[PDB]
Design a binder for this molecule. Structure first.
Ligand SMILES: CCCCCCCCCCCCCCCCCC(=O)OC[C@H](COP(=O)([O-])OCC(O)COP(=O)([O-])OC[C@@H](COC(=O)CCCCCCCCCCCCCCCCC)OC(=O)CCCCCCCCCCCCCCCCC)OC(=O)CCCCCCCCCCCCCCCCC
Ligand SMILES: CCCCCCCCCCCCCCCCC[C@@H](O)O[C@H](CO[C@H](O)CCCCCCCCCCCCCCC)COP(=O)(O)OCC[N+](C)(C)C
Ligand SMILES: CCCCCCCC/C=C\CCCCCCCC(=O)OC[C@H](COP(=O)(O)OCCN)OC(=O)CCCCCCC/C=C\CCCCCCCC
Ligand SMILES: CCCCCCCC/C=C\CCCCCCCC(=O)OC[C@H](COP(=O)(O)OCCN)OC(=O)CCCCCCC/C=C\CCCCCCCC
Ligand SMILES: CCCCCCCC/C=C\CCCCCCCC(=O)O[C@H](COC(=O)CCCCCCC/C=C/CCCCCCCC)COP(=O)(O)OCCN
Ligand code: SF4
Ligand code: SF4
Ligand code: SF4
Lengths: 160, 70, 156, 210, 99, 96, 303, 176
């Protein structure tokens, strides 16, 4: 997630369709957002780090969130009224397919809706971002930076 | 020189020629080759309505001549 | 096929439209601006090329940096660049704007306007002559002519 | 040029006017301390880039006074001639830009044609249109080309008509008079105290010309 | 009917051409990145409103000239214009037209 | 009078090789003046002069349509002039 | 065939406006010892087309905080009013023959200020709001004297019908009967359209620009109809159309000339100009033109 | 001696007052300005047809830099570094060593076009006229890097412009 990131921006963009549709009201999906600067610094340090030749890293954020309250926080920062209505998984797929038609880059795709709904895995065995000497930045510090432009406090609860 | 301004001006003139002329031609084509009848004051409107009824083709422009007096 | 032909023709039309009317906003920072105003003078007549005289930033197409960029002025120039509609270009005029020039080793001078904004055309000289600036503007026109957006979108 | 101006207005009236400068501070005076005198000469072209050879002349006079030498008479006559040409250039710039800001905008072109001719004179004498660096602290760099005085005479016998056209456009116009008359009135004592010079003094009746 | 059709056509053409102008550059992808309350400006609007009312009163003059009572209508029209001039003069002398 | 200016216009049309050449020069150089041929360039540039024009317009160049490797029917520029004709064209000398 | 008539009225005005810009640049350039656009097209003839295409292909900068409703509505109103005010005009025959054509045009011109007000208030800026307020005040101020001068002139016509103006001026122009009113009317039309010396203030910007230029052309055409009467022969209206177009072109070129010839007023200076030089003279001449037909037994017929 | 610019007193007789009132009411000076502009329209413009026509120049004109060579074909530069010393903007960088035949020649001769002020001090400081500032001015560039000249670029410029450069030096060397 970042300033020119789709994920923070993608949720904010929907407000246009009035309501926000989340499969199972977003109650069965957990996410692990990571800051863009953190990933770039991790890549730089991995370039610098000599023993990270054949290793595999997992860059994750500090806090896990349910989809519903994450979208709620995104809409709260943007000062946009938030209405969430459950949508059938098959119904959601249909909308994505309709969207997929455009010559121009699509707002959403079937793979994207399915991908967003899925909860982020957890791989504690893989070396993480902290092994590269970087402290992951919480989304609460950069939410205002990303979402100030979407306008014209109460951080979301995390699960660990 | 200054006459190089004349082309664009000419275009404007042509663009300003089209509306008025067009109206006149349409007024000649819709009103049977004559000037469109103006109707203020509600008396000219009565004259037009009387003309429409007399012709029998439901058109004010068609004119019934003396030949229709028997 | 016809799919490439139609996008090629439309791309040519769009490029001709964009390069046949370039509306510049000019930062008259220093002495380079005086030659700028001589390119609008009757002898050279920038307006006869479709290049309008002193366009507003809200509807400008090309940014001409004419003069020294100090540290105190750089944020304002960056903001003005950020306030431009997307099909925008920057022309760096003169040696001070190109690389700091005759105040390169100064404590209060940006060593080239390209540290702040990307630059499309560099016009050399101190100041560059009116004809030299006209040559640069014409060159920018050819560069715009060479670009191709619909083709890239088609092959992508 | 480039100016930031912070002002407080009570309704239409300007209660206070504050200019913030330094947007073109390049540190010329500190850079001069790292050059020789000849190397430091071209900075004065850049100081007042509407009147170049006048700055050249001032710097050359200072260096000559410190050196206890004097230029040859022909150099001095050339200096005064090109200083008067520079004065014509600067006054054209000033008047036409004043009118342009107010809104006339036609004499700007009318007189920048003559300004282009005077840059042709500069280029013929020095090889540079506006930053010649011709006046050196020992005289001038090069002698005039053999056909320059004739062209200067030909130019200068036609300029009075251009000034007359400018006056036709400006001097008797009621809009221009209403824009300029009784605006920015300064008293002679205030002008002398505040450090004014040139026209800003002579507009208040002070009889002073260096 | 004809006036309604003409107004509808003008509005429709303006709306369509504004929409195409506003949507043609939105198909291609880009970066996609107080109090003072001056009092004289209110007096200008109020004076305009009052003079517009008096103009509304003056409007039936072209038909007023065929009444057979020409002396009375001339007297009343001149009276209305005199009071309009008097309103202007009163607002002038009370420093109501200053800046 | 007016007949004479029309005659000079017709002479300009006839002096460019007909209507085809007239349209060619009008759309390539935005000018239809005719002058004495001063010289021909080894790259295809033609140089004309007319001393009756005011200073600045008394010399001009008609560019070639194909220089070293590119099509130059439309994309002409001032860097295509060789140094000798560059000196002549910029009035740095009176001798071609 | 009323749709065809509407389209044949509405399209040539827009083309005329596009070409007017070329003429304005070209006329000004030759007045400044230079040329206008003469590279894009044989004589700059392709310059308006390139300008239109570039402006229509350039990104629109929506303020990201403004009321999109009024932001869209204002150009719609501007274009609609500008195109509507051409309907009443008779060249020689009007598209719509109104009894109160002049009054209808007055009402439309009165509406014209809502676009300025909405554009200023939707701009989401204090300074643009102040500028819009100044423009609206100037517009209402000068439309007052426009209305008074217009009724004073129509007192010799006998009605508000625009066609009757052709019958009134069959022998002599109206400029000779009352030139001072024509002078003040010309200045008031200059000040209404925010034209020099009164010019104190991608897609929607072009929309407003075409609206303003169409208003300029329409104002000049109305002035030519009102004060420079062309002789109309019923069996060949093309002569009247040619004369009317020539006079309108001359008046528009006169606006360009005045723009090229003068400096600009201050705001308070034009306020003082109107309220202390035009209004008293306008009222005095209105009294004079009321009393004049009665003194001379020269009252126009229609009632 | 001094003159008064605005020390006139308008006459107060009836004819003068009537003349001023006629000026105020009929806008006579505005018509005079209009007439000046109208007359000025009907005269030939001063615009030249660039790039097909070019502005006048002089043999002294300072343009793009070039390194010259002798008629035999050896370069005139002897690595004296006087141009580098005199350069007011420090735009010249020079490195030299003895050539394989023992000649005194440069191995590096760079001029930064973006630090150059085009003053011409370098060409007048040169003892052997190795470096000159030629007549070319139409060398605008799309990147900052191509405006950083090395010895090869300057030698190529000299070989490219030598004819015109030599002609200009022949025309102007008797003034130097
Ligand atoms: C007006 C009616 C048409 C004739 C016309 O405009 O001539 C103006 C011409 C004006 O003289 P001028 O341009 O000052 O004299 C310059 C030389 O004639 C300079 O003559 P030139 O060698 O430049 O002539 C080139 C020639 C050819 O020019 C062109 O082909 C390009 C212009 C095409 C215009 C379309 O231009 C013309 O003579 C015809 C002008 C375009 C007429 C349309 O003579 C008049 O008609 C005076 C009319 C009274 C005006 C008040
Ligand atoms: C009625 C329906 C309208 C729909 C929308 C379209 C709007 C109107 C379209 C008409 C626009 C006219 C375009 C004509 C431009 C060509 C100009 C020509 O002169 O350019 C030459 C050729 O250059 C380019 O190659 C021209 C390419 C232009 C496009 C070619 C065909 C495009 C037509 C497709 C239109 C279909 C629209 C479909 C969507 C509705 C070279 O000029 P240039 O180099 O600059 O200047 C050099 C300056 N010199 C000579 C002094 C040195
Ligand atoms: C006075 C006369 C007035 C005439 C009226 C105006 C007529 C209007 C004529 C319209 C000309 C056609 C304009 C087409 C150009 C569109 C702009 C453009 O080039 O966009 C390129 C853009 C680049 O995007 P990406 O590469 O994917 O992303 C990079 C950025 N991150 O690609 C596109 O979006 C292509 C858009 C589809 C165009 C296909 C058809 C061609 C256009 C015809 C116009 C269609 C409506 C009519
Ligand atoms: C906006 C334009 C409103 C005015 C339209 C009509 C003006 C007019 O004078 O024409 C009236 C015309 C003929 O009358 P006369 O000229 O006297 O001569 C005919 C008798 N022989 O007859 C008509 O009125 C027909 C049309 C009337 C109905 C519609 C009129 C306009 C009503 C618009 C309603 C919607 C407004 C929405 C908000 C508006 C905000 C700008
Ligand atoms: C015997 C029976 C006759 C009855 C009596 C009738 C006699 C009429 C005598 C008087 C008529 C003259 C009235 C004309 C309007 C005069 C208004 C006026 O003079 O106001 C000016 C203002 O005038 C202007 O400044 C306007 C200039 C705006 C620029 C426009 C350029 C002018 C040239 C354009 C050409 C005009 C074309 C007119 C005809 C148009 C045809 C449609 C005063 O301002 P200041 O001089 O600054 O002084 C005020 C401080 N005390
Ligand atoms: S680049 Fe040269 S001419 Fe331009 S402002 Fe700097 S010193 Fe002056
Ligand atoms: S012209 Fe002047 S600034 Fe440029 S390299 Fe030569 S000495 Fe240095
Ligand atoms: S002054 Fe001349 S010879 Fe000496 S180093 Fe410079 S270019 Fe070479």
């Amino acid at each position: 997630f970042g300033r020119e990131d789709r994920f923070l921006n993608y949720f904010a963009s929907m407000r246009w369709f009035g309501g926000v549709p989340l499969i199972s009201l977003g109650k069965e999906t957990v996410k692990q957002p990571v800051y863009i600067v953190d990933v770039s610094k991790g890549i730089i340090n991995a370039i610098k780090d000599p023993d990270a030749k054949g290793k595999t890293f997992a860059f994750v954020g500090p806090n896990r969130y349910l989809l519903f309250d994450l979208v709620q926080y995104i809409f709260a920062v943007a000062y946009r009224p938030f209405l969430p209505y459950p949508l059938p998984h098959f119904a959601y797929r249909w909308v994505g397919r309709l969207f997929e038609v455009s010559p121009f880059e699509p707002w959403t795709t079937r793979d994207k809706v399915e991908r967003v709904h899925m909860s982020d895995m957890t791989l504690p065995h893989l070396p993480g971002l902290e092994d590269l000497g970087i402290q992951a930045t919480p989304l609460e510090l950069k939410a205002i930076e990303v979402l100030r432009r979407h306008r014209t406090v109460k951080p979301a609860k995390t699960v660990n | 020189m200054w006459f190089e301004i004349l082309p664009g001006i000419a275009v404007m003139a042509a663009c300003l020629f089209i509306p008025g002329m067009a109206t006149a031609h349409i007024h000649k084509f819709t009103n049977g080759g004559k000037e469109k009848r103006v109707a203020h004051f509600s008396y000219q409107w009565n004259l037009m309505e009387r003309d429409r009824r007399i012709s029998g083709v439901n058109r004010y422009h068609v004119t019934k001549g003396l030949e229709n007096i028997d | 096929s016809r799919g490439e032909y139609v996008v090629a023709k439309l791309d040519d039309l769009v490029n001709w439209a964009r390069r046949s009317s370039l509306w510049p906003m000019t930062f008259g920072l220093a002495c380079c601006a005086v030659e700028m105003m001589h390119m609008a003078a009757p002898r050279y007549d920038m307006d006869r090329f479709g290049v309008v005289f002193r366009a507003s930033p809200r509807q400008s197409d090309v940014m001409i940096v004419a003069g020294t960029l100090t540290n105190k002025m750089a944020p304002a120039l960056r903001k003005v660049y950020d306030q431009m509609p997307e099909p925008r270009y920057v022309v760096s005029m003169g040696s001070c704007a190109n690389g700091g020039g005759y105040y390169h080793y100064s404590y209060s001078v940006v060593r080239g306007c390209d540290r702040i904004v990307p630059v499309d055309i560099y016009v050399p000289g101190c100041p560059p002559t009116a004809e030299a600036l006209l040559y640069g503007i014409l060159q920018l026109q050819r560069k715009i002519k060479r670009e191709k957006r619909l083709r890239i979108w088609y092959r992508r | 040029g480039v100016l930031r101006l912070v002002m407080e207005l009570s309704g239409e009236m300007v209660r206070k006017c504050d200019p913030h400068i330094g947007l073109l501070h390049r540190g010329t005076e500190k850079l001069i301390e790292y050059k020789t005198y000849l190397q430091a000469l071209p900075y004065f072209d850049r100081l007042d880039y509407v009147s170049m050879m006048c700055n050249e002349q001032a710097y050359s006079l200072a260096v000559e006074k410190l050196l206890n030498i004097q230029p040859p008479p022909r150099a001095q006559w050339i200096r005064v001639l090109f200083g008067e040409i520079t004065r014509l250039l600067n006054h054209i710039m000033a008047v036409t830009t004043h009118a342009l800001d107010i809104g006339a905008m036609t004499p700007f072109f009318w007189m920048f044609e003559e300004r282009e001719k005077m840059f042709e004179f500069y280029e013929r004498v020095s090889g540079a249109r506006m930053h010649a660096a011709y006046i050196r602290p020992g005289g001038v760099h090069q002698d005039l080309p053999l056909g320059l005085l004739d062209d200067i005479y030909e130019f200068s016998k036609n300029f009075s008509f251009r000034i007359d056209e400018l006056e036709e456009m400006l001097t008797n116009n009621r809009i221009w008079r209403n824009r300029t008359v009784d605006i920015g009135v300064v008293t002679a004592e205030d002008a002398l105290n505040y450090g004014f010079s040139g026209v800003m003094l002579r507009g208040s009746g002070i009889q002073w010309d260096l | 009917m004809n006036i309604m059709l003409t107004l509808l056509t003008n509005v429709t053409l303006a709306s369509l051409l504004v929409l195409i102008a506003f949507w043609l550059p939105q198909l291609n992808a880009y970066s996609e990145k107080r109090l003072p309350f001056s009092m004289k400006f209110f007096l200008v609007a109020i004076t305009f409103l009052l003079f517009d009312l008096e103009i509304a009163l003056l409007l039936p003059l072209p038909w007023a000239s065929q009444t057979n009572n020409l002396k009375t209508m001339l007297t009343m029209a001149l009276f209305l214009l005199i009071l309009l001039a008097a309103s202007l003069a009163y607002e002038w002398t009370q420093k109501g037209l200053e800046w | 009078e007016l007949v004479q200016v029309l005659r000079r216009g017709l002479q300009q049309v006839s002096g460019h090789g007909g209507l085809r050449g007239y349209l060619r020069v009008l759309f390539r150089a935005n000018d239809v003046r005719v002058g004495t041929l001063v010289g021909e360039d080894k790259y295809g540039n033609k140089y004309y002069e007319d001393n009756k024009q005011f200073f600045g317009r008394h010399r001009w160049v008609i560019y070639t349509t194909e220089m070293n490797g590119r099509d130059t029917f439309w994309d002409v520029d001032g860097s295509m002039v060789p140094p000798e004709w560059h000196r002549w064209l910029h009035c740095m000398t009176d001798d071609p | 065939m009323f749709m065809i008539n509407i389209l044949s009225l509405i399209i040539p005005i827009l083309l005329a406006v596009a070409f007017l810009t070329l003429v304005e640049r070209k006329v000004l350039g030759y007045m400044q010892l230079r040329k206008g656009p003469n590279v894009v097209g044989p004589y700059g003839l392709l310059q308006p087309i390139a300008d239109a295409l570039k402006l229509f292909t350039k990104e629109p900068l929506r303020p990201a905080t403004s009321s999109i409703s009024m932001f869209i509505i204002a150009p719609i109103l501007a274009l609609s009013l500008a195109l509507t005010m051409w309907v009443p005009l008779p060249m020689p025959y009007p598209l719509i023959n109104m009894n109160l054509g002049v009054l209808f045009m007055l009402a439309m011109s009165s509406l014209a200020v809502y676009s300025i007000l909405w554009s200023g208030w939707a701009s989401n800026s204090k300074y643009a709001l102040i500028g819009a307020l100044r423009a609206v005040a100037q517009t209402i101020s000068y439309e007052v004297t426009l209305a008074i001068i217009l009724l004073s002139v129509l007192l010799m016509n006998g009605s508000y019908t625009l066609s009757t103006l052709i019958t009134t001026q069959e022998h002599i122009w109206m400029i000779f009967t009352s030139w001072p009113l024509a002078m003040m009317w010309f200045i008031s039309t200059l000040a209404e359209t925010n034209r020099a010396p009164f010019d104190l203030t991608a897609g929607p910007f072009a929309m407003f620009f075409m609206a303003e230029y169409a208003n300029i052309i329409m104002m000049n055409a109305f002035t030519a109809i009102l004060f420079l009467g062309a002789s109309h022969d019923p069996h060949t209206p093309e002569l009247y159309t040619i004369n009317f177009v020539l006079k309108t072109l001359a008046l528009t070129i006169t606006f360009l000339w005045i723009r090229a010839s003068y400096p600009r007023f201050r705001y308070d200076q034009l306020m003082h100009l109107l309220w202390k030089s035009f209004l008293p003279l306008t009222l005095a001449l209105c009294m004079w033109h009321i009393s004049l037909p009665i003194m001379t037994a020269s009252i126009p017929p229609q009632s | 001696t001094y003159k008064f610019v605005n020390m006139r007193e308008p006459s107060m007789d009836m004819k003068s007052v009537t003349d001023r009132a006629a000026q105020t009411l009929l806008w006579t000076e505005l018509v005079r300005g209009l007439g000046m502009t109208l007359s000025y329209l009907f005269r030939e413009p001063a615009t030249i047809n660039y790039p097909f026509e070019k502005g006048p120049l002089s043999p002294r004109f300072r343009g793009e830099h070039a390194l010259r060579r002798y008629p035999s074909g050896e370069e005139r530069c002897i690595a004296c570094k006087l141009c580098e010393a005199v350069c007011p903007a420090q735009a010249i960088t020079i490195e030299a060593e003895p050539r394989a035949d023992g000649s005194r020649r440069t191995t590096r001769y760079d001029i930064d076009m973006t630090k150059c002020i085009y003053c011409g001090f370098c060409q007048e400081a040169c003892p052997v006229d190795a470096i000159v500032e030629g007549p070319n001015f139409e060398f605008s560039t799309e990147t900052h890097e191509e405006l950083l000249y090395n010895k090869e670029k300057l030698l190529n410029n000299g070989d490219k412009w030598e004819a015109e450069i030599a002609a200009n030096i022949q025309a102007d060397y008797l003034y130097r």
